[PDB]
Amino acid sequence: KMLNIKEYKEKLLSTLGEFLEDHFPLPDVNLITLHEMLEILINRLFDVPHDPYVKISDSFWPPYVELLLRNGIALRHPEDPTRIRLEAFHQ
Amino acid sequence: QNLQMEIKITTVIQHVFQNLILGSKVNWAEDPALKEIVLQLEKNVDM
Amino acid sequence: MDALQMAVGYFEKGPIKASQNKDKTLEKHLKTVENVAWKNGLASEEIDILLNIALSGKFGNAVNTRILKCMIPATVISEDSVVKAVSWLCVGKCSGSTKVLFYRWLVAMFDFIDRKEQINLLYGFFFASLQDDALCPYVCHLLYLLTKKENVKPFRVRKLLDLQAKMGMQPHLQALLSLYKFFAPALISVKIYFKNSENLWKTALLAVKQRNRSP
Structure with missing residues (x-):
């Protein structure tokens, strides 16, 4: 069961990365890829389950943040605009 | 602690991929790989 | 060719130039399709073609509406x-309106x-359409x-509970929520009549096939 889930997860991740690079590329400060942004969000969601909010820096392309917000993937902090969290789809 | 959290992470990745495919408005049936991967979603990881 | 295949090819060619006699040609092809559809029905291949042609951006809203209202199978429909x-x-x-008509047709x-x-x-794609309050009852009936x-x-x-809190205890929402409760009572506490569920595609042959569908 474990190895099956691992194969699925790795396949899903590789295909998701290829889809992101093919459909959400950077235009050309130092911006990070949407893949790295999603990785940071997913990592903070499970490393700090009591505070999954990450601060929005200048390396976050505002179109990427608005894209994640419109599609229900990212959620804004109720009071702090500089922080966004990942929607806990596992619960 | 690995298996349960990996199940949760895989569920999160499923949902994120599905929402991104929906937001991109891509005719995913035209792309064969994208089509066969879209049908891979909606699989209960805890099975 | 055959009478219907000419129309299928005409619709596969997409919209053409400015209308000199093209309105009458489009009308003749569409009338041939619906006549074949309302007499004995369409095959799976023709349906696979015309349904996706109508749901695409090609042709106006009236053409797509009529195509959808004449998507009546003579045997079965391919899931692809x-x-x-x-x-x-x-x-x-x-x-x-085309999306509403397509959900009605799918139901x-x-x-x-x-x-x-x-x-x-595709349950995720179907469920994500609950945000739209124009598709909400039909999407609930489909789910x-x-x-x-x-x-x-x-x-x-x-x-779904948050959507129920936002919209109120709507009948379709309550039916879907009762189904969810039946399937998973531990995740939450709380099939049949749905509004605007009239069968727009009910020909006589489709009726005899629906009654043969109950052995």
């Missing part, structure tokens, strides 16, 4: 056609799809027929 139709819906260049033609497992694989036990995930239960 429905998958491509859901993809065309995801494209977004489809009219809202009415549910027992005429050969297989439904690949359609159930009431499509939902299995595997599709009742905790995230979906939470989102």
Whole structure:
């Protein structure tokens, strides 16, 4: 069961990365890829389950943040605009 | 602690991929790989 | 050719130049299709073609509406056609009334799809359309027929409860929520009549096939 889930997860991740690079590329400060942004969000969601909010820096392309917000993937902090969290789809 | 959290992470990745495919408005049936991967979603990881 | 295949090819060619006699030609082809559809029905291939042509951005809203209202199968409907139709819906260049009509058609033609497992694989795309309050009752009616036990995930239960709190205890929402409660009582406490569920595609031959569908 474990190895099956691992194969699925790795396949899903590789295909998701290829889809992101093919459909959400950077235009050309130092911006990070949407893949790295999603990785940071997913990592903070499970490393700090009591505070999954990450601060929005200048390396976050505002179109990427608005894209994640419109599609229900990212959620804004109720009071702090500089922080966004990942929607806990596992619960 | 690995298996349960990996199940949760895989569920999160499923949902994120599905929402991104929906937001991109891509005719995913035209792309064969994208089509066969879209049908891979909606699989209960805890099975 | 044959009378219908000419019309199928004409619709596959897409819209043409400015109308000198083209309105009459389009009308003749569309009338031939519906006549064949309302007499004995259409084959799976022709349906696979015309449904996805109508759900695409090609042709106006009236042509797509008439094509949808004449999508009556003579035997069965291929599930791959429905998958491509859901993809065309995801494209977004489809009219809202056309989306409502397509969901109505999917509900009415549910027992005429050969297989439904690949359609159930699109449960996420179907469920994400609950945000739209113009598609909400029809999407609920479709999910009431499509939902299995595997599709009742905790995230979906939470989102459906939030939608119930936003819209109120609507009949379609309550039916879908009762189904979810039947499948997963531990995730939440709380099939049949739905409004605007009149079968627009009920020909006589489709009626005899629906009654033969109950052995």
